[PDB]
Specification:
Radius of gyration of chain A: 27 Å
Number of helices of chain D: 0
Bound molecules: magnesium ion
Subcellular location (chain B): Cytoplasm; Nucleus, Nucleolus
Radius of gyration of chain D: 22 Å
Number of strands of chain D: 2
Protein name (chain E): Large ribosomal subunit protein uL3
Helix content of chain D: under 10%
Order of helices and strands of chain D: EE
Largest sheet of chain A: 2 strands, antiparallel
Helix content of chain A: 10-25%
Largest sheet of chain D: 2 strands, antiparallel
Chains: A alpha+beta (98), B mainly beta (170), C mainly beta (136), D mainly beta (48)
Protein name (chain B): Small ribosomal subunit protein eS6A
Strand order of the largest sheet of chain D: 1-2
Oligomer: part of a larger assembly
Family (chain E): Belongs to the universal ribosomal protein uL3 family.
Shape of chain D: elongated
Order of helices and strands of chain A: EEEEHH
Structural class of chain D: mainly beta
Subcellular location (chain E): Cytoplasm
Amino acid sequence: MKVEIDSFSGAKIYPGRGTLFVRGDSKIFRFQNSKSASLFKQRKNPRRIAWTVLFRKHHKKGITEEVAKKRSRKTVKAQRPITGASLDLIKERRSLKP
Amino acid sequence: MKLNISYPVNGSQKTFEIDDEHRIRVFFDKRIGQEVDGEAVGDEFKGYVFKISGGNDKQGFPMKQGVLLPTRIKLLLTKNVSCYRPRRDGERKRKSVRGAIVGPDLAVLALVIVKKGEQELEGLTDTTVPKRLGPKRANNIRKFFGLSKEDDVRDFVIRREVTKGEKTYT
Amino acid sequence: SGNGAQGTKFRISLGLPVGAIMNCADNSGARNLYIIAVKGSGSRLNRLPAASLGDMVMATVKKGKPELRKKVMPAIVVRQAKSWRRRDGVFLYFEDNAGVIANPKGEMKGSAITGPVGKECADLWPRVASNSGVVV
Amino acid sequence: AGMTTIVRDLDRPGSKFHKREVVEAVTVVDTPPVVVVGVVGYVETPRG
Amino acid sequence: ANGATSFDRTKKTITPMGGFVHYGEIKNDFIMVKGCIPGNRKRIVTLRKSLYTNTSRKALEEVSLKWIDTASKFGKGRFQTPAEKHAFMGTLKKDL
RNA sequence: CUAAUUAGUGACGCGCAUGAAUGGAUUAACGAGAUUCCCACUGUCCCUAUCUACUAUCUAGCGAAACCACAGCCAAGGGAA
RNA sequence: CAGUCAAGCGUUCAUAGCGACAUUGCUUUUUGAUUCUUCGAUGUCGGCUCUUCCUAUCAUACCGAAGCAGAAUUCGGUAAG
RNA sequence: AAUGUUACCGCAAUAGUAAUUGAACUUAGUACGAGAGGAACAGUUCAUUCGGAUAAUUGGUUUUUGCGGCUGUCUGAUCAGGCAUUGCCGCGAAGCUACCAUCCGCUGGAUUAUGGCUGAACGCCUCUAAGUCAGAAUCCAUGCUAGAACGCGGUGAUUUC
RNA sequence: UGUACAACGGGGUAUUGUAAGCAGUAGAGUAGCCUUGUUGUUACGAUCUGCUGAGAUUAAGCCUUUGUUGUCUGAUUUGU
RNA sequence: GAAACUGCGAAUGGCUCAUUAAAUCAGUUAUCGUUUAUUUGAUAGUUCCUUUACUACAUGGUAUAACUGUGGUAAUUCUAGA
Ligand SMILES: [Mg+2]
Ligand SMILES: [Mg+2]
Ligand SMILES: [Mg+2]
Ligand SMILES: [Mg+2]
Ligand SMILES: [Mg+2]
Ligand SMILES: [Mg+2]
Ligand SMILES: [Mg+2]
Ligand SMILES: [Mg+2]
Ligand SMILES: [Mg+2]
Ligand SMILES: [Mg+2]
Ligand SMILES: [Mg+2]
Ligand SMILES: [Mg+2]
Ligand SMILES: [Mg+2]
Ligand SMILES: [Mg+2]
Ligand SMILES: [Mg+2]
Ligand SMILES: [Mg+2]
Ligand SMILES: [Mg+2]
Ligand SMILES: [Mg+2]
Ligand SMILES: [Mg+2]
Ligand SMILES: [Mg+2]
Ligand SMILES: [Mg+2]
Ligand SMILES: [Mg+2]
Ligand SMILES: [Mg+2]
Ligand SMILES: [Mg+2]
Ligand SMILES: [Mg+2]
Ligand SMILES: [Mg+2]
Ligand SMILES: [Mg+2]
Ligand SMILES: [Mg+2]
Ligand SMILES: [Mg+2]
Ligand SMILES: [Mg+2]
Ligand SMILES: [Mg+2]
Ligand SMILES: [Mg+2]
Ligand SMILES: [Mg+2]
Ligand SMILES: [Mg+2]
Ligand SMILES: [Mg+2]
Ligand SMILES: [Mg+2]
Ligand SMILES: [Mg+2]
Ligand SMILES: [Mg+2]
Ligand SMILES: [Mg+2]
Ligand SMILES: [Mg+2]
Ligand SMILES: [Mg+2]
Ligand SMILES: [Mg+2]
Ligand SMILES: [Mg+2]
Ligand SMILES: [Mg+2]
Ligand SMILES: [Mg+2]
Ligand SMILES: [Mg+2]
Ligand SMILES: [Mg+2]
Ligand SMILES: [Mg+2]
Ligand SMILES: [Mg+2]
Ligand SMILES: [Mg+2]
Ligand SMILES: [Mg+2]
Ligand SMILES: [Mg+2]
Ligand SMILES: [Mg+2]
Ligand SMILES: [Mg+2]
Ligand SMILES: [Mg+2]
Ligand SMILES: [Mg+2]
Ligand SMILES: [Mg+2]
Ligand SMILES: [Mg+2]
Ligand SMILES: [Mg+2]
Ligand SMILES: [Mg+2]
Ligand SMILES: [Mg+2]
């Protein structure tokens, strides 16, 4: 079971829901309901339709903490200095001077 | 689906096969670069944080960071780009590509250890493999050993032992 | 459908009653197909036989090579406009009505099929599956 | 009460949809426990 | 988790968002029967044991639900749970 | 012309019984004139569904007509069949 | 529309399937013959709609024959669900 | 209406009655045949015609005159509205609704034709005379709809100014 | 006279597509006063943006409710 | 000295005669109307900074192939993660 997404509005489409349209060029369009489908047939442009996802993304509407900072990072600091070089003597030369 | 996991600290890699779609399901709708806590995936991995690095679906098409989508498209790939190796100068090609959002259609999820859990993984933390090659360029030798250029790099270069018959070389 | 079809088809909404004209989607030289009958269809007083995706119809060619015209031949419906429903629960539809001219066995007259094809049809007629590009 | 929709895997060897998912309509009837207040016995007669 | 599933797992009952249109919430045990039943919503109904034993192969199939639609029936329901709605819609002018 | 045409049109003519102001033939333009096909259009149809108003319907007041041998459940029989 | 006789047909073989010369019938969606009812009025052909009935059965169930190897077909029975 | 009143739960006389046809896979390139050709039963998956429901889904319907948009004019402007036989357009819940949508359509017995058993008449022989086995989209039940307003049962409570 | 019933109000559900108001360095531009501009100023301008997935509507046969206000003995008839 | 990186070549060659009728092409012109890898000949003392507590010049930076290792696809001169 996959939940699809309307190719106009950006709404989730649960199974059995809405309609599917196969265009002449074999591009597939899925609408959650007859509303988006009609708008679509009207050549309306989602970015000009206020309630759509594409419109809200473009006009940057309430994205908020998604652009806020997050914590993902790491630390390693280990050594396996060279292959065939007898690494036993590689940690001895590794104390340096400074 | 198969999990291909790497420990970048030791240079170790081992795979894993996870059935039981509920355990897999933790990765679904997750993009590349997002971390994943281990316990959900299994008990063997607990407290292990996994970075999603990529993978291939059935039919073998590779994921490409940045496309989003949980699906395949056909892009036009230039030089210096992933999932393309140009055969000729200025040669671009149009090729099928899998999205960067994880889904059930994947054959293999590639992962990278970030934080280690509370239990040792068989072929990962237990074994370590050496860096194949050492510093070549002058200052790079100096900066691997921190030499503060006085110390005459010629002594500090790495030397590899090789055996020919009863003759052992360097 | 009937003769030469490997397998069975699940019922799909009937979109093309007798008299409908659909695009001819192969390279045979025909521009369109005028449906005069549907194979395997039944009988009710006043009911028009109608074709659905995957069905075999009898047809004439209204626009096309004069050698194709003025005669009745078999053809197979590869695309519907009327919405139908699959068992995976989706209502879907194409942008046009189209079929391809074929012999009673199900073998195709032309070498290729332009445009998408419905899988219900592809599964039903092997020869159509061969010559098809994007399916569904 | 009403109806809703269901998704489930179909087990039907030989069917094109064997092992595939199908989506199906179902009704729902509200059935709180019934309570027993009595018994009637019936006897057979030539009139029924 | 009446309306939940081995596969779905999310805690929810079979009551749709906004509740069964023209009925209510279903706070007791229930029978979920495939397809449709004679009579209308709110009507008294009798369910009866079969008068024979079906082999049929269509009977005897042992079903396992993957998912039960809990979306609203009072319009075109876009959401299974108020959680899912808040998840997708973000925050609104009433809210917190 | 159509898949298919007692239709239409173009030809043919020992034409039951065409034919020259009993006017013959031709004819642009015009026609709520008869006929044929085509494009568009469409609930004419496949195959039906839904909505609005006013009716019907129930109430107050008002209040006709047609028709009427006697009347009003059938099957068969005979009988002006 | 259906029989009886059986000379013929059917490579041979009357009657698998047929069948002359003759002859006995049945039917009342043919057409005639009649003129009984209706001329102080029983609204015409066809179609559309819709119900029911008949069986001399086209299909579908189960059978018996064959000049029935199979496949196909033909003849016949119970059959109008 | 009336068989005391009123209520609940039931019986079943009689009457009605319903399901229908095809294809594919497989059997099987098998049986049969010199070859050319070439089946069926059991099993499976779909379909046709018909029927009874139902509205989760999809579609149709719009006076939800619900939200928005538009022309013309009228209220000084604004806001907010009126008028144009529902002014017009897009979307539009609810309801209704569609092989344009989904679901559901039972199994026992007795028989016909016909093939038989035992078996005389007729020392032999015969399915028939006596007796008898198997048997059809038939018929009778099962099941389904009504419930006799002059067919019936079980049960509850039964009035004082 | 009580998980009573009703009229409102609240919350959910659903439909539309961002209300009025105010503000702006958004705006083809246009005028008026001079102290004639080293953003000169006062305003005006289809439209645009912000507060604003807002505002409006939502049972008339949607769901729900610890809130408010109210309602809770009229008429007729029946017996073995 | 494999592999790979870098550089250069792959715009030459070979083939065909479809288009093309003031086009091409030919002889003759023009660049005071432009671009030109290459070959050949020439051609570069100046690079920092309010210009004493000074700038790596004895020479500054990583990030990658090949490789190692873990992989995906029926399938290609496909390629992913480490
Ligand atoms: Mg709709
Ligand atoms: Mg619509
Ligand atoms: Mg007709
Ligand atoms: Mg081919
Ligand atoms: Mg509802
Ligand atoms: Mg609804
Ligand atoms: Mg003619
Ligand atoms: Mg005509
Ligand atoms: Mg003529
Ligand atoms: Mg003539
Ligand atoms: Mg004559
Ligand atoms: Mg004269
Ligand atoms: Mg004359
Ligand atoms: Mg003239
Ligand atoms: Mg005219
Ligand atoms: Mg009337
Ligand atoms: Mg009244
Ligand atoms: Mg009155
Ligand atoms: Mg009057
Ligand atoms: Mg009578
Ligand atoms: Mg009598
Ligand atoms: Mg004779
Ligand atoms: Mg013989
Ligand atoms: Mg003879
Ligand atoms: Mg006749
Ligand atoms: Mg007379
Ligand atoms: Mg007469
Ligand atoms: Mg008369
Ligand atoms: Mg009279
Ligand atoms: Mg009269
Ligand atoms: Mg009459
Ligand atoms: Mg013989
Ligand atoms: Mg028989
Ligand atoms: Mg009948
Ligand atoms: Mg009394
Ligand atoms: Mg075979
Ligand atoms: Mg032979
Ligand atoms: Mg029928
Ligand atoms: Mg309006
Ligand atoms: Mg105006
Ligand atoms: Mg204003
Ligand atoms: Mg006025
Ligand atoms: Mg007027
Ligand atoms: Mg609706
Ligand atoms: Mg039906
Ligand atoms: Mg019986
Ligand atoms: Mg015997
Ligand atoms: Mg017998
Ligand atoms: Mg007997
Ligand atoms: Mg006898
Ligand atoms: Mg039957
Ligand atoms: Mg039964
Ligand atoms: Mg039944
Ligand atoms: Mg009664
Ligand atoms: Mg009683
Ligand atoms: Mg806004
Ligand atoms: Mg009402
Ligand atoms: Mg309150
Ligand atoms: Mg009140
Ligand atoms: Mg050349
Ligand atoms: Mg870098």
